[PDB]
Paper text:
In all living cells the signal recognition particle (SRP) recognizes nascent polypeptides destined for secretion or membrane insertion as they emerge from translating ribosomes. As SRP binds to signal sequences emerging from the ribosomes, the resulting complex composed of the SRP and the ribosome-nascent chain complex is then targeted towards the membrane through the GTP-dependent interaction with the membrane-associated SRP receptor (SR also named FtsY in bacteria). We describe the X-ray structures of [name] and [name] the two protein constituting the proteinaceous core of the SRP from the hyperthermophilic archaeon [name]. [name] and [name] constitute the conserved core in all archaeal and eukaryotic SRPs.
Two molecules of [name] associate in a dimer with an extended β-sheet surface built around the anti-parallel association of their respective β2 strands. Observation of the crystal packing in the orthorhombic subunit reveals a tetrameric arrangement between symmetry-related molecules that is similar to the one observed in the monoclinic form. Pfu-[name] is characterized by a more extended β-sheet due to longer β2 and β3 strands when compared with all other available [name] structures. The loop L1, the primary RNA-binding surface is rigid and well defined in density whereas the loop L2 is disordered and absent in our final models. The disordered L2 region of the “free” protein has a well-defined conformation in the RNA bound structures. In contrast the L1 loop remains structurally unchanged, this is observed even when all available structures of free and RNA-bound [name] from different species are compared. Through an induced fit mechanism involving the rearrangement of its disordered L2 loop, [name] assists proper folding of the SRP RNA and therefore favors subsequent binding of [name].
Author numbering: 2 to 58, 65 to 105
Write the structure that this text describes.
């Protein structure tokens, strides 16, 4: 259905109390809004709206939200998005370790 994606929800750097929803091993480090949008697009989700606000200032320096429509539930959608981002980054780096 339609739901919002907040980068913290799939960020492996974070604890669950602080917002991570996705299992630790599936989550990716510092998911960027642009990465989430591209992942959603590759998964053929419909991107409704993207908001990104960067303000000169700590943890509130960056704000980002993506409104998506997916054929799947939010939890499954988030897992697929996280996996797609990992795949993206690996493709670009072309290497496993630094």
């Amino acid at each position: 259905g339609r739901f919002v994606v907040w980068p913290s929800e799939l960020d492996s750097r974070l604890s669950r109390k602080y917002g991570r929803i996705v299992p630790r091993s599936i989550a990716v480090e510092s998911p960027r809004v642009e990465e989430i949008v591209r992942a959603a697009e590759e998964l053929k989700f419909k991107v409704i709206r993207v908001e990104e606000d960067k303000l000169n200032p700590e943890e509130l320096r960056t704000f980002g939200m993506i409104v998506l429509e997916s054929p799947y539930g939010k939890s499954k959608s988030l897992k697929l998005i996280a996996q797609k981002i990992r795949e993206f980054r690996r493709r670009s780096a072309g290497t496993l370790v630094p």
